[PDB]
Amino acid sequence: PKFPRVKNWEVGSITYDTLSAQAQQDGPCTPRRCLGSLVFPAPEQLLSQARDFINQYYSSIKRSGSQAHEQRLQEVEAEVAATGTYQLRESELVFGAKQAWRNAPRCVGRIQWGKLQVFDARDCRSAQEMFTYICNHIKYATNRGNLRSAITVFPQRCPGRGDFRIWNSQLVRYAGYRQQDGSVRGDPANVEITELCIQHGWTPGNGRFDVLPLLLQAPDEPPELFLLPPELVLEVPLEHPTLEWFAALGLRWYALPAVSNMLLEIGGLEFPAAPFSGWYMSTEIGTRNLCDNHRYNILEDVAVCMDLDTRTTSSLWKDKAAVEINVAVLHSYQLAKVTIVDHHAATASFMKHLENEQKARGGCPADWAWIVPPISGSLTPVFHQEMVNYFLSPAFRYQPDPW
Amino acid sequence: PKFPRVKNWEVGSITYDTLSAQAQQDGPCTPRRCLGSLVFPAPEQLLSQARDFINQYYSSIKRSGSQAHEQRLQEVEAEVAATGTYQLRESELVFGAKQAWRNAPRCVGRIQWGKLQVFDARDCRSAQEMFTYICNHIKYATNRGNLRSAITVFPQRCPGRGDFRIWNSQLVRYAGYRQQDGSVRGDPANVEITELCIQHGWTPGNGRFDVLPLLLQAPDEPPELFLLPPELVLEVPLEHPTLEWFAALGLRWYALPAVSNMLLEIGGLEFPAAPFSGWYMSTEIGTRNLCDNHRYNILEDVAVCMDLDTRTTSSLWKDKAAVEINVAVLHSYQLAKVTIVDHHAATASFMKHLENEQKARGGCPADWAWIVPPISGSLTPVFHQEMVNYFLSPAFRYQPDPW
Ligand code: HEM
Ligand code: HEM
Ligand SMILES: Cc1cc(N)nc2cc(-c3ccc4c(c3)CN(C)CCO4)ccc12
Ligand SMILES: Cc1cc(N)nc2cc(-c3ccc4c(c3)CN(C)CCO4)ccc12
Ligand SMILES: C[C@H](O)[C@H](O)[C@H]1CNc2nc(N)[nH]c(=O)c2N1
Ligand SMILES: C[C@H](O)[C@H](O)[C@H]1CNc2nc(N)[nH]c(=O)c2N1
Ligand SMILES: [Ca+2]
Ligand SMILES: [Ca+2]
Ligand SMILES: [Ca+2]
Ligand SMILES: [Cl-]
Ligand SMILES: [Cl-]
Ligand SMILES: [Gd]
Ligand SMILES: [Zn+2]
């Protein structure tokens, strides 16, 4: 209860999550009912979060209780007393961004958490400068297909001044053009941002894979529209290693998953614009983006081309077609020399992360429903691993739309 | 919080679960941390549970607050007064067994909950009579392959007297023989029960699909060994519709899923011996029982016979082999005229069940991790359905091993 027992049912091994008892915010579940599956769940309170964060920082460098540790706490206290807020040291920004990734319960890629390039954009002053920072991020992270995890963090929230915001949910997204019938051409997940781009002066295309422009918001200004140079946006045309007609579907996806609408919280400070990027796990593209019925929805078309019996569920035509689409994604990215990880390799690495984190901190916050991949769930080790979900800070958080 | 909002992300539809608010007991989650992924979470007290169940019963038959209702309440009160417990009427038992199934959050098959044959074995006296009840159950439920859902209810627990227990976790289980090289021949899940059968006088076999005897326990006298007549245990040899070598693997599974180690709780009364059965969803056999690494673990055997590239994860050889194993299960059961349901059909029916239960009770307790199938998760509609998990009574509960 205070220290929950956690069992792995494949191996029989047992751990106790002692870290969850330190959970700093509250989630949606109660003893009466679990809401784990739901997608969406000053000075002295600021100082409490700040002090805890400084403690985490000095612990991570094995200098807990040092003079420098004590002096930084007093320095933070003095700044909050004088200004009501404080400024992170450069080293604290880097550490805090890595901690926020480490703490993200829904991320299966966290074995990489210590390897994150942190771009400090806290002196950004305009939307134009914001765009320059974002382009340098995309160029660095993409690296001609040898992807590198990165985050750029723009100025923190402060009283008497609006937030920096990136209106787009990701730095690279395909347009979704809503038709008169209610159908969509392109990505149905992006209908709202597409219409906002048009409203703010973008001349729309009419393709299924039109890369959207960015809507960048500087403090107290309407969003400004910026087009990404096409040479900056690396894409992979999709082909299949043995189904030669697959290439004639004309499908593609982009190299760089870069989420831009989440809020980064470090030490009680809030960074509403802090886009971050890694590389794709193949099921995100091959299973969710392409096969979700409410996304590109290609499953029946692929099955029909494969000459599967789409008239009865028990032929497992959906399963067979989904598998080949995921094969196509892995083959195409590997052929293009663009970083990609399959769901077996990624979940294997996450098991090693759990072991590392059990030794380092006595547990790991993890959201089973998001860690288990959307195909072949029980064929991966994480399916059989019990998990404890809780909120630690530093953190990436959902935040309301700026419109 | 009181009435959780529940969203379907494929359709966009919204419901509010007003049934969760009536959750009688308490689960393992708290605002600090979610434990939803974990497998295992006074006459005045009995009267209170008995009272609420009788009300459920008379409400269910549209006889609320009537004379028969008022009379039954006072009869239980008087029976508790003279005995310390009370007896269900056979019709209340039928109602309660159906509600316990309806209330089971981890069961995807609950569209069928109103169709359940209840065998009243509460007059049972001995392990010999227990074996006859169980054999009648298996014969009725198997029905030469046209499976029918059923439950047999043995006498309730009572003070100063041992329980009836079925030591086996299922009525049909394959033996698990520990080999000298450390490995297991047969089903590794059943190593403990296999050794207990041998302990209690069973002459073991040496095959990979040897059906175990039953260890049956009458009150206070010890467990007795019983052999199931081979003609009563319907099995399905597994072949593949196009991979002719699949049959040569010698795989088989049994027709009847009949769980025998859970406790049934109705109106404060507890039945530690109440085996219940339905029919299989194909992923249970093809994915979990045959492909779990700690079960039969045949995935690589099949992939070698399919000439798949097993030295790289990104060939998705595990996924392709799993798909064909699941095809083999569906094809073999359909060819044998044994009832089976695929995971697409089953999850579609559960969505209809959720819709039914929203109108009837304002919600439905559902455990997302158990409802979503172990392959092709997001290809099924339940993956995109938010769910609320909570404990309602009457209920099936886990209980300690009788040894
Ligand atoms: C390096 C390779 C990475 C891989 C393979 C990876 C993989 C994933 C996957 C599969 C998800 C589930 C999202 C979905 O369902 O599509 C996810 C979520 C998430 N990832 Fe990672 N990730 C990586 C890097 C990163 C980085 C660099 C960060 C931040 C610095 C990060 C933070 C997050 C967060 C916050 C979520 C949850 C998003 C939400 O709740 O909406 N990830 N990741
Ligand atoms: C009629 C066809 C049925 C189907 C297709 C079905 C399907 C399933 C499935 C797939 C599970 C998940 C467990 C697993 O991974 O194997 C489950 C669990 C469960 N089922 Fe159903 N079931 C059926 C009938 C029944 C009946 C008749 C009852 C009781 C009267 C029942 C009660 C339960 C319970 C209590 C669980 C929870 C198991 C646990 O927590 O260990 N089911 N069922
Ligand atoms: C940094 C990073 C790397 C990576 N490889 N993937 C990521 C995926 C998300 C993500 C967050 C939410 C979300 C989805 C994906 C997709 N689902 C299908 C629908 C909408 O919900 C966030 C960050 C990622
Ligand atoms: C009535 C019925 C019908 C049906 N078709 N399946 C059922 C499955 C269970 C079940 C019970 C426990 C359990 C598991 C499944 C799953 N795995 C194998 C881990 C072990 O835990 C119980 C009753 C079922
Ligand atoms: C209803 C359900 O919680 C929702 O569809 C979740 C399930 N698990 C997921 N898991 C991942 N990785 N990504 C998702 O978007 C979702 N969606
Ligand atoms: C840890 C995890 O909750 C556990 O292994 C669950 C996951 N989902 C499951 N789902 C079903 N249907 N059956 C199971 O045994 C499990 N096991
Ligand atoms: Ca300063
Ligand atoms: Ca009778
Ligand atoms: Ca080979
Ligand atoms: Cl994506
Ligand atoms: Cl089973
Ligand atoms: Gd070909
Ligand atoms: Zn929970």
Author numbering:
A (entry chain B), B (entry chain A): 66 to 106, 119 to 480
Quote the study that presented this structure, word for word:
Humans and other mammals express three different NOS isoforms: endothelial NOS (eNOS), neuronal NOS (nNOS), and inducible NOS (iNOS). nNOS is an important therapeutic target since the overproduction of NO by nNOS in the brain is associated with a number of neurodegenerative diseases. Thus, nNOS is an attractive target for therapeutic intervention. Here, we used a combination of crystallography, mutagenesis, and computational methods to better understand the structural basis for these differences in NOS inhibitor binding.
First, we examined the sequence variations between hnNOS and heNOS in the region Ile598–Ile611, where the backbone changes occur in hnNOS. The position of Asn606 in hnNOS corresponds to Pro370 in heNOS. Since the single residue variation between Asn606 in hnNOS and Pro370 in heNOS does not appear to be the reason for the backbone dynamic differences, we next analyzed the connection between BH4 binding and the structural changes induced by inhibitor binding in this region. Our mutagenesis results showed that this is not the case.
